[PDB]
Amino acid sequence: HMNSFVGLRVVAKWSSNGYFYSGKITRDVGAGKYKLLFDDGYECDVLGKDILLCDPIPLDTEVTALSPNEYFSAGVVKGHRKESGELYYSIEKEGQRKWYKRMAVILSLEQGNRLREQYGLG
């Protein structure tokens, strides 16, 4: 039904790793899989059920923000904005909000499962 998923930004995980990372679909490789180019440069084929077609990550989503002191901490998306073409998320934690670059925001398995119903490609 869909014209094409190529070029769409997503957050996706591979198997045996429980986090979703931001990336983009570069190719429909069939077999229910898509070639995903992660923002860090890593590229591999991922199952449709492991892809959340949401960009930006919606507001009021509980996410995992990579934080100072190599600290991964759960927080809630309260805003996003483009800064010279780059997407930044406003994440609320301990009742305070801070800006994080796109790549510093990931989803744990539980956090991503909450979005599968609405945004998953399963």
Residue numbers in the entry: 1482 to 1603
From the paper:
The DNA damage response protein 53BP1 (p53-binding protein 1) influences the cell cycle dependency of DNA double-strand break (DSB) repair pathway selection. The localization of 53BP1 to chromatin also requires that it binds histone H4 di-methylated at K20 (H4K20me2) via a tandem Tudor domain (53BP1TT), while BRCA1-BARD1 recruitment requires unmethylated H4K20 recognized by an Ankyrin repeat domain in BARD1. We show that a series of water-soluble small molecules targeting the methyl-lysine binding cavity in 53BP1TT function by stabilizing a previously unknown lowly populated autoinhibited homodimeric state of 53BP1TT in which the histone binding surface of H4K20me2 is buried within the protomeric interface. Our work therefore identifies an auto-associated form of 53BP1—autoinhibited for chromatin binding—that can be stabilized by small molecule ligands encapsulated between two 53BP1 protomers.
To test the possibility of a pre-existing 53BP1TT homodimer, we created a 53BP1TT mutant (53BP1TT-PN) in which E1549 and D1550 were replaced by a proline and an asparagine, respectively, to introduce a 3D structure-preserving β-turn in 53BP1TT. These mutations eliminate the six salt bridges at the 53BP1TT dimer interface but do not affect the small molecule-binding surface. We verified that the structural integrity of 53BP1TT-PN was preserved by determining a 2.20 Å resolution crystal structure of this protein variant. The backbone dynamic properties of wild-type 53BP1TT and 53BP1TT-PN were quite similar as shown using NMR relaxation measurements. As expected, 53BP1TT-PN also bound UNC1078. The most likely interpretation for the absence of interaction of 53BP1TT-PN with UNC2170, UNC2991 and UNC3474 is that these small molecules do not cause 53BP1TT dimerization directly. Instead, they only bind to and stabilize a pre-existing 53BP1TT homodimer population, shifting the equilibrium toward homodimer. When overlaid, the 1H-15N HSQC spectra of wild-type 53BP1TT and 53BP1TT-PN showed small chemical shift changes that map to the inter-53BP1TT interface in 53BP1TT-UNC3474. This is further evidence for a preexisting small population of 53BP1TT homodimer that is eliminated in 53BP1TT-PN. We showed that 53BP1TT constructs engineered to prevent auto-association—while preserving the ligand binding cage—have no affinity for the small molecule ligands, and yet, they bind H4KC20me2 and p53K382me2 like wild-type 53BP1TT.
